[PDB]
């Protein structure tokens, strides 16, 4: 294939009016990349520089090759690296690199950008292997003072992409850091005339920070770099400042340990000074800097709480600076928007920062904030009163109970009075502030003196502007959550009134500013905390939601706009969520209405556009099944088609909820579940084997295996091997990336494996010969639990895992598995779980059981 033919393929792939020709071209391109990668890469690089080719085809050439060289998936990354190294000949490599460098200095910025990304991908492969030594010399020379602007900027882009494209948790660019910094800082320093170049340099520097540890450990280099960054924060151009402050914040987060001299000698004074800028963007920059400091010092405190002997040390920047920083933040609170728009601004950032200060510094925040509140809560300007309640609410988390209780008692009359303020913004924030008081120190509201006035303010507010009503629903949730646990609880005396008020807000005609949905959410809370003493109010909710569902189903949807229809769907979702909670909370009350409910649910399922609410319908059907037990069997024939269709819609979230139905009936049908188990297993085996399955399906299915095994017991043995294979495969799957999303997903998978093993060990309690060949596998998983804090720090996870240690031990008194019970990590894990006081007492009891059984195992 020639350059011209390849270019024609690319062009046709994106520009042909004929979709057939587009797909044919894409297939032929991928096929050449598979059959002759050397030629594919060479030709791609030649089209990149071919002026005779349309711009989009040249950009596409570069980006497609780039996407065959780097990936997010680490495994794909490694495969691409080895393919470049072994399958592209040295002469081909040299030609591709030369062509990419030619395109980098193109007068067309789109060509230059694509070329920069391609250069970055190749560099990410070669520099860690001590290759392409010419590149960094070219980059350093290219950002030299007398180079033209486009060459500087394109090269700085390439350096940024280089650092961003490398794995964050890697040493791939360490060996190049010196030259990277030279090239980057050359563009960042004050002598550089182009704002675009300084911006690109600072953004690249931010990208590079994770690769310059060795440089930051050198005092002279660290000093010079920090000097350049600070110089940039004082630059005249506001975008340059913004970029430099991004750098400063990232440096503080990554290299906190080195910041004390820079804080003392300059940054404290500088950032405090600019926090008073009349420009909201500048001030916002300084605010973000101090929020970063607070976040890091809170994280240090947390880590030292988990391990008192960790080397990390806080310098207490925030604590020492409160006197000088906090008054400026408070002043920023009066820069709200003169309505309604709700768009973010510096005043909201300053509020979040103030809350970080209070969490980090406790009682030290009180004096300046309380002074501001006193000065402004009765001011004539609505901005000052709103700022006052914002500040007061923002210090309710951090200080000790004595101080908070004292000042809540002192301020509650004025705060409740602000619920009658003429300013909508003031009332909105006042309702929020009452929620903050309730949420952190609910006992601060004296049951006789102020709780009736608090409840009354919430009830009036639910009838106010929807913005106020939403915050009143949130506040009611906080009140119930924080007061229900006390015995007696005062909040139950107000349950009828509260419920009545919430029903009224749920009966709003619209959901403007989320006031109606929020009310439904609070109703769910009311249900979940209801006691027998307020049984009647529970009944009131049940009656309301059932009737309400009926009402929504009288609405002719062919007279609705798209927006109208979305509103109706969200309302039906709110209703069905509360209804599911009602059904689960009082199973005895459900039988008489079961038929009617299913009649409605099937109707909802047969509606056109049922795909939008079918998830919530399945949640309610599952709750009804759980509550009726064997009484649900009469609906199974009619429900089966829907269930199977939902289970097979592996792309849609409805399949997850359908798995949740299986989980419910496995528990609620008792003996009667066995007659369906085989069919369920078959379906599930297909589902988890479907490549079109969304990721969230995998953990759900794993967990439900545990449910099934738990209820069918020995009937599970013929499936055991297959299921164990799945569990093993799942527990040995590394995170896809180092990103937070991949690690969190992996945690979900491991949690589901824990569910599976718990259910299996419970089900096979009497069949140790069936479990025996998997004990070591289970112990490998448990070791994973003991190693990763995202697992063992969770009370329920540790309770289940240490429970497995004990129960498995109890199943084998023959000593056939005693070899696992002498391991230091097992003993240590049992002891950490038994002693850690943030673990509940049920967890510690389970750890005791595990310790008894482990010691007995060593006795054998």
């Amino acid at each position: 294939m020639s350059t011209a033919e390849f270019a024609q393929l690319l062009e046709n792939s994106i520009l042909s009016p004929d979709q057939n020709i587009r797909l044919t071209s894409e297939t032929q391109l991928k096929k050449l990349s598979n059959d002759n990668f050397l030629q594919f890469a060479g030709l791609s690089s030649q089209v990149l520089i071919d002026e005779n080719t349309k711009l989009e085809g040249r950009i596409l050439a570069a980006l497609t090759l780039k996407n065959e060289l780097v990936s997010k998936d680490s495994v794909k990354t490694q495969q691409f690296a080895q393919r470049w190294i072994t399958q592209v000949s040295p002469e081909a490599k040299n030609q591709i690199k030369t062509n990419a460098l030619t395109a980098l200095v193109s007068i067309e910025p789109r060509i230059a950008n694509a070329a920069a990304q391609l250069i970055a991908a190749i560099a990410d492969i070669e520099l860690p292997h001590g290759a392409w030594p010419e590149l960094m010399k070219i980059m350093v020379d290219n950002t030299g003072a007398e180079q033209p602007e486009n060459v500087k900027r394109a090269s700085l882009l390439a350096l940024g992409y280089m650092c961003e494209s490398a794995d964050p948790q890697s040493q791939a660019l360490v060996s190049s850091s010196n030259n990277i910094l030279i090239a980057i800082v050359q563009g960042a320093q004050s002598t550089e005339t182009s704002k675009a170049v300084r911006l690109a340099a600072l953004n690249a520097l931010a990208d590079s920070l994770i690769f310059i540890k060795n440089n930051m450990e050198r005092e002279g280099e660290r000093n010079y770099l920090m000097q350049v960054v600070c110089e940039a924060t004082q630059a005249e151009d506001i975008e340059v400042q913004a970029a430099a402050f991004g750098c400063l914040c990232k440096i503080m987060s990554l290299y906190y340990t080195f910041m004390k001299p820079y804080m003392e000698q300059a940054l404290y004074a500088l950032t405090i000074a600019t926090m008073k800028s009349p420009n909201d963007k500048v001030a916002s920059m300084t605010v973000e800097f101090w929020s970063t400091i607070c976040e890091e010092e809170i994280d240090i405190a947390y880590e030292l709480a988990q391990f008192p002997q960790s080397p990390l040390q806080s310098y207490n920047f925030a604590l020492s600076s409160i006197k000088d920083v906090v008054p400026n933040l408070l002043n920023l609170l009066t820069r709200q928007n003169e309505d309604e728009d709700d768009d973010w601004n510096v005043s909201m950032s300053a509020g979040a920062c103030l809350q970080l200060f209070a969490q980090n510094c406790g009682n030290h925040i009180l004096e300046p904030v309380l002074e501001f509140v006193e000065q402004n809560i009765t001011a004539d300007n609505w901005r000052n009163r709103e700022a006052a309640v914002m500040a007061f609410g923002s210090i309710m988390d951090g200080p000790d109970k004595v101080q908070r209780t004292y000042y809540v008692h002192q301020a509650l009359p004025s705060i409740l009075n602000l619920m009658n303020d003429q300013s909508l913004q003031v009332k909105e924030t006042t309702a929020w502030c009452i929620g903050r008081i309730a949420d952190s120190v609910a006992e601060s509201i004296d049951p006789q003196q102020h709780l009736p006035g608090v409840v009354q303010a919430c009830l009036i507010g639910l009838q106010d502007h929807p913005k106020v009503a939403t915050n009143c629903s949130w506040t009611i949730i906080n009140l119930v959550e924080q007061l229900a646990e006390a015995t007696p609880s005062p909040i139950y005396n107000f349950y009828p009134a509260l419920v009545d008020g919430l029903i009224g807000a749920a009966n709003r005609i619209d959901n403007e500013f989320n006031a109606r949905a929020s009310a439904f959410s609070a109703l769910t809370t009311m249900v979940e905390y209801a006691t027998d003493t307020v049984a009647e109010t529970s009944a009131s909710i049940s009656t309301f939601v059932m009737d309400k569902l009926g009402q929504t189903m009288s609405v002719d949807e062919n007279q609705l706009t798209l927006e109208d229809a979305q509103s109706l769907q969200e309302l039906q979702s709110n209703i069905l969520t509360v209804l599911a909670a009602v059904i689960r909370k009082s199973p005895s009350s459900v039988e008489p209405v079961a038929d009617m409910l299913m009649g409605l649910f099937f109707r909802l399922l047969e509606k056109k556009d049922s795909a939008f609410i079918e998830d919530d319908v399945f949640y309610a059907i599952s709750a009804l099944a759980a509550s009726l037990g064997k009484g649900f069997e009469k609906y199974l024939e009619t429900f089966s088609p829907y269930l199977l269709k939902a289970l097979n819609q592996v792309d849609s979230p409805v399949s997850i909820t359908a798995v949740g139905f299986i989980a419910d009936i496995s528990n609620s049908l008792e003996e009667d579940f066995r007659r369906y188990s085989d069919a369920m297993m078959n379906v599930l085996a297909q589902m988890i084997s479907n490549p079109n399955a969304r990721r969230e399906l995998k953990p759900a299915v794993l967990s439900v295996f545990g449910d099934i095994a738990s209820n069918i017991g020995a009937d599970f043995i013929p499936y055991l091997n297959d299921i164990m294979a799945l569990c093993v495969a799942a527990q040995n799957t590394k995170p896809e990336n180092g990103t937070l999303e991949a690690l969190d997903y992996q945690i979900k998978v491991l949690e589901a494996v824990l569910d599976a093993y718990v259910g299996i060990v419970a089900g096979l309690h009497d069949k140790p010969e069936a479990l025996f060949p998997y004990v070591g596998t289970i112990f490998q998983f448990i070791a994973q639990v003991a190693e990763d804090p995202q697992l063992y720090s969770e009370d329920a996870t540790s309770r289940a895992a240490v429970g497995l240690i004990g129960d498995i031990a109890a199943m084998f008194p023959d000593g056939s598995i005693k070899q696992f019970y002498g391991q230091d990590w097992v003993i240590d894990y049992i002891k950490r779980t038994r002693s850690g006081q943030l673990f509940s007492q049920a967890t510690k009891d389970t750890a005791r059981w595990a310790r008894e059984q482990q010691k007995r195992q060593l006795s054998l």
Partner: peptide, 29 residues
């Protein structure tokens, strides 16, 4: 005195004076 004692007089010359990144980074000077 290993405590945070900031100055109200900022000075960002942590080391106008001429300075090259090439003379700093990797320079060991």
């Amino acid at each position: 005195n290993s405590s945070f004692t900031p100055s109200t007089v900022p000075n960002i010359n942590f080391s106008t004076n001429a300075l090259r990144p090439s003379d700093i980074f990797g320079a060991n000077a």
